[PDB]
Amino acid sequence: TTLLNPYFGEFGGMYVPQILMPALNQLEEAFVSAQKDPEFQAQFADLLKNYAGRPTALTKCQNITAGTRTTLYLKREDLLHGGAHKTNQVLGQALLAKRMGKSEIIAETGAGQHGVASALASALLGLKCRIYMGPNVFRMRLMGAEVLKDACNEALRDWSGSYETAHYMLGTAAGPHPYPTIVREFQRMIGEETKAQILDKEGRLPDAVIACVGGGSNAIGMFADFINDTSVGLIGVEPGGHGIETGEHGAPLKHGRVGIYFGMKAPMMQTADGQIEESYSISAGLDFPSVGPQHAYLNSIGRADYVSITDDEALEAFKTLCRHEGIIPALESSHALAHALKMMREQPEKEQLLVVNLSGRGDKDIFTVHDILKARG
Template sequence: MGAKDVERQSPNVFRMRLMGAEVIPVHSGSATLKDACNEALRDWSTNYQKAHYLLGTAAGPHPFPTIVREFQKMIGEETKQQILKVEGRLPDAVIACVGGGSNAIGMFADFIDEKNVQLIGVEPAGKGIDTDQHGAPLKHGRTGIFFGMKSPLMQDKFGQVEESYSISAGLDFPSVGPQHAYLNSIGRAEYVSITDDEALDAFQILCKKEGIIPALESSHALAYAIKMANAEPNKEQIIVVNLSGRGDKDIFTVQEILDKKGVL
């Protein structure tokens, strides 16, 4: 696990260690997700006879993106069943955050053939999509080879991988799963971006209005849903947001930022 992410997600790391897991911080590179993946692949290739590589995001060489989608697609299957039971029809839009894209492909999978359902993936715009501090390879990257996959990649003119940035550790990734690249290329899914500040606003809204603390990753999807609803306040529409994680792990990050802003 990237050393920076160990710090950002210290509650999760503490839980893992309590349950007996060995968590090894990776200090190379930007000390984030991509560097942890690099080290895991390097270790696996050396010790493949006694180790197995497990990846939680929908990226990397085949068959890993497919494996992740197959295990995650229950999200979309259950969502479809429940919305039909409650509303009697499918949603107008389904929104999920996208870093590597595991929760999003899990949510989208069962809706891909439902052409009237808009699929929207939300990338992290970080400090601003026009700055060098974001994590939006689908809109601002170029096709490259990364982790044994061909997919949009944040890279410089020499093809070197650039560092991504997001307030959310889970979205801080310079590429994206190839399934999302395909959905984007055929126009089946739309990919947009949300800044740190917009995600933080959505985080606070859900906390105060619903008593739910969302993950910062999920807050990006929530922020776009709020923006979408506000754009057409008189339109009757069903928007489903995949609230893909709890925010317990992010409360210290959020507290530090809001304290500096004098919000709380």
């Protein structure tokens, strides 16, 4: 029994050991209660405005689109405190933890952004935060935190006989219900602001909104408020790694099969006999073998289209934004920008209004990009 539907079509669910169902049911009930509580919404809004820095800017990119009929805006989640969109929903989940009378936080992280997001939120709200399997390491320790697909398996292990005291801060729109729903609702101000901002600046909805997809939280955050606007295209960009043809990628939604893992039924990269494969991307934040079930659902009904961008395309978009707009983007975000640049360049007389979710800043990536550039020459 649940209050909300755990599935998006055939995708989603709560595929966890029986012993974790009370934790998931507790969390879902607290979330449903919190969404109807004006005091909770006001406290979350306070944190987002006065601590995280919302609303984030919407930046027009005239230098990049000169000589084409593309108008390009970047939704600037790179300007959010912490440097990425992850901060939005850790603030909400930390408030939910406190609503449930809990005082410990468990988390994991690939690109460090979510682990540092979990640590900063825990420091602000007085929660004892413990992170599994993460520079980023020193930040989390500075912020008082006690410190991989298996990373996602590290925390569930503790949250087992812990949830009476601790909350598992899942970092993307995936995992067992209610997390795909909670993470969407705590990220949807991305798309809500973008819609208001585009309307103010252009007097019309975008032709398409474009976001990179790892587990799916920044993309579903951007998409959610546009889903019922049937003329707005929703484009999610998975990592193509060295190329889909190489098998060294992170694009299960396109090139993968439905399976059951990490508490959800969803497309995943897996061997012929159902072992969960290892993904690959130049960007640690997209290096995820599955995808959130709402993206699988949106794909299946044709509401959203999913594409892939290779390491080299992402690298070129990273350089392009640095040189022509003075913004250093996360390599994750550069996948979304790269696809927008392709939409523009392939059809330069097509009139189109595009928004790219610039999910984070790329200071974390400057060492990685420097080594690749130097190794090239």
